[model samples]
Target: GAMDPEFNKAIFTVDAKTTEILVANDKACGLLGYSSQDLIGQKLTQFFLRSDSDVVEALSEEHMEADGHAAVVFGTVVDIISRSGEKIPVSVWMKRMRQERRLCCVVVLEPVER
Candidate 1:
């Protein structure tokens, strides 16, 4: 089980290019009021909403802009559109792992922002 027990904040992982949800923790599932299976095949783009569209483009990472501010500095504030009607806000960051084989790790943290 990919369950993260007693996490201070919700945590979940997703594919970079595919943007598919790979692993979801306890905080994530319960925070979203859903199950692990339901989030398994889902993509982050489908469930993720950005507080700023301007930063969305920067998240592309295609530019490879590794400047002090280019590389993921502050977590991008995003709104996770949960299964229910109300959307949940969280800080998410994409950490580049591999050259092309692996994927980006999208971490979702709750109660960090408004």
Candidate 2:
């Protein structure tokens, strides 16, 4: 099912171990100009800005613990590139999750006014 059109909500899950996308919502695919099937099993880096690797490094456990604590929510500004190679700036809000001893995360991307 899709969320309300009034809200530009895109939800996706990523594997913490490989940083690969596991699942994505319709809005996610639509926003990124990709089909849900295409987006799944893909690396999250593909949708992010040019400095995506750096951003991922910052999202690591080491960076999370830099403040002497584990972070539940990791928020940042990121740009998602559409299939046409258009950049869309967004505010990403993600939270860590543990399921069956596997680390994962659910990400929500909100369109940002640039």
Candidate 3:
């Protein structure tokens, strides 16, 4: 949801455990060189980004974000590579995917350098 352009980023959602690309916003498609709808149900790392360091080790720190508490949250580290292969750092955020609710663990995405 590009809730606000001011909020920034071309975000996407994923299954943290499976690391599959569930959905992606236009921001991702435009900046990352992906077709607006090409990579559905594909691997997250298989896209224009990958972990600059440890992927799951960062994801290993993956826990629930307190965002629902409207509160301070926790997260992990990653880098988003554009088709140009530039480093676009990201911070990963977890979610319940509450629009319809499901058995899946959903997470949203991006920006930080570590």
Q: For candidate 3, what is the lDDT?
A: 0.49
Clashes of 3: 0
The superposed Cα distance between candidate 1 and the true structure at residue 41, in angstroms, equals 1.2
Off by over 4 Å in 1: 1-5, 50-75, 97-101
TM-score of each: 0.57, 0.65, 0.51
Task: List, residue by residue over 14-55, the lDDT tens digit for candidate 2.
Answer: 877666678776777766765558877675556655434634
Best by TM-score: 2
Worst 10 residues of 2 by lDDT: 64-73
In model 1, the Cα lDDT at residue 54 comes to 28
Candidate 3: deviation at residue 71, Å?
27
lDDT of the candidates, in the order given:
0.55, 0.62, 0.49
lDDT of 1 by residue, 1-114 (tens): 343347544666766675556767666777766546777876544454533452354446523236555433325565555556356666666665543468666566554443
Order of all candidates by TM-score, from best down to worst?
2, 1, 3
TM-score of 1: 0.57
Evaluation by lDDT, superior candidate among 2 and 3: 2
Clashing pairs in 1: none
Instruction: Work out candidate 2's RMSD over C-alphas.
Output: 5.2
